[PDB]
């Protein structure tokens, strides 16, 4: 079959900290030469990916020493000794035993770590000048939230919501979210979140 792999998709990192990102494989990636067949890759935010580690542990040339690789045939671990802003990105766990390579997997979403934020839920009813062209979009503006693990429900149901996840910044290192509910004439005549910043659902309507 295929060696389907999992990883800590939402591992946080903070400046000045050593981080431990992992990968788990169903089969054994160790070769008959005793050579683990896993490749750690890094994709920068809005840039070309780069090859960090090959053969499980070793560097690529030009990749800083701050990445180290190790692990057994199934479990693999990359430790970042010194976390930086270029380190923040997506980490890809690539197997080699079998290549066809349909997808690169979910990938580890790495973000700069702060404390849990307070999700600001702002309901914006569509403007009356939107209603002349036959369209309507009430936007649930989730703002200053962390992590990006919040789903927005549309009741009074859902299914017409489109996703807009945003850039995490430098000074605030938070997230913003837009659940765009494009809508039509008659059905225009409420959004709430389950983000970890709060516990009870905060429901506000247009």
């Amino acid at each position: 079959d295929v060696v389907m792999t999992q990883s800590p998709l939402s591992l946080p990192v903070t400046p000045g900290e050593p981080a431990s990102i992992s990968c788990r494989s169903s089969q054994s990636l160790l070769h008959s030469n005793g050579y683990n067949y896993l490749d750690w890759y890094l994709q920068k935010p809005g840039q070309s990916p780069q090859l960090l580690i090959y053969l499980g542990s070793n560097r690529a040339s030009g990749v800083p020493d701050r990445f180290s690789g190790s692990g057994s045939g199934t479990d693999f671990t990359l430790k970042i000794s010194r976390v930086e802003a270029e380190d923040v990105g997506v980490y890809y766990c690539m197997q080699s035993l079998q290549t066809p390579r349909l997808t690169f997997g979910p990938g580890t979403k790495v973000d700069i770590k702060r404390t849990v934020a307070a999700p600001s839920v702002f309901i914006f009813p569509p403007s009356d000048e939107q209603l002349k062209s036959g369209t309507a979009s009430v936007v649930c503006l989730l703002n200053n939230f962390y992590p990006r693990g919040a789903k927005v429900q549309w009741k009074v149901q859902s299914g017409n919501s489109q996703e807009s996840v945003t850039e995490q910044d430098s000074k605030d290192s938070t997230y913003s979210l837009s659940s765009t509910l494009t809508l039509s004439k008659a059905d225009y005549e409420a959004c709430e979140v389950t983000h970890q910043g709060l516990s009870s659902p905060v429901t506000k309507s247009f």
Binding site: D39, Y41, Q43, Q47, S48, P49, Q50, L51, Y54, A60, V90, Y92, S96, T99, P100, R101, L102, T103, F104, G105, G107, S120, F122, I123, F124, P125, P126, S127, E129, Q130, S133, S137, V139, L141, N143, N144, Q162, E163, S164, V165, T166, E167, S176, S178, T180, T182, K204
Partner: protein, 205 residues
């Protein structure tokens, strides 16, 4: 040093032909196996195909879905790799990466944003976001393609200004809502580059 400089962007409609050219500089082209890997908007990588090295046999192998239509070729004498994108579809509306190895994607080149949409080029339909009682925003929706820049107070306010990324509707258009969060009146201008359509709006609840 080594570079994998790319070219082949433009406009294509569902059912057309396109060319992706990758020029490798720095090492011998013949012994590396070229691969084409593509980044669907919103997620990471998806491998499209790869041709074997010239001396390995030049045996091409694509993904089952893109097998046949896409044609991977190469050449040492002018040192160029071609990805013949025939019959482009909505999955080809994505960034494409020229990767320096069949099973070791090293340099990744730069990345070509290939767009495959049936829409046309018109300016944005700026709709405001009246505050409930707060934050003040305005829409950008009904625009295509993606050059875009939306600021608030016309480049005067920068703290709390946060423009949302593009959203693709099933009808082939693009969606942006730019937002500011500050108590108060605020003015938002949107510049559509390809047709040069600048629309300005002031918002009250």
């Amino acid at each position: 040093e080594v570079q994998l400089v790319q070219s082949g962007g433009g406009l294509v409609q569902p059912g057309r032909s396109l060319r992706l050219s990758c020029t490798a500089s720095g090492f011998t082209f013949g012994d590396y196996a070229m691969s084409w890997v593509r980044q669907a908007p919103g997620k990471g990588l998806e491998w499209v195909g790869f041709i074997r090295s010239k001396a390995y046999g030049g045996t091409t192998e694509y993904a089952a879905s893109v097998k046949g239509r896409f044609t991977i070729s190469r050449d040492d004498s002018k040192s160029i790799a071609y990805l013949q994108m025939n019959s482009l579809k909505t999955e080809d509306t994505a960034v494409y990466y020229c990767t320096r190895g069949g099973t070791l994607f090293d340099y990744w080149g730069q990345g070509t944003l290939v767009t495959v949409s049936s829409a046309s080029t018109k300016g944005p339909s700026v709709f405001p976001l009246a505050p409930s009682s707060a934050a003040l925003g305005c829409l950008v929706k009904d625009y295509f393609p993606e050059p875009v820049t939306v600021s608030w107070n016309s480049g005067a306010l920068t703290s709390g200004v946060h423009t949302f990324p593009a959203v693709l509707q099933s009808s082939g258009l693009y969606s942006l809502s730019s937002v500011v969060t500050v108590p108060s009146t605020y003015i938002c201008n949107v510049n559509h580059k390809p047709s040069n359509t600048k629309v300005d709006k002031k918002v009250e609840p």
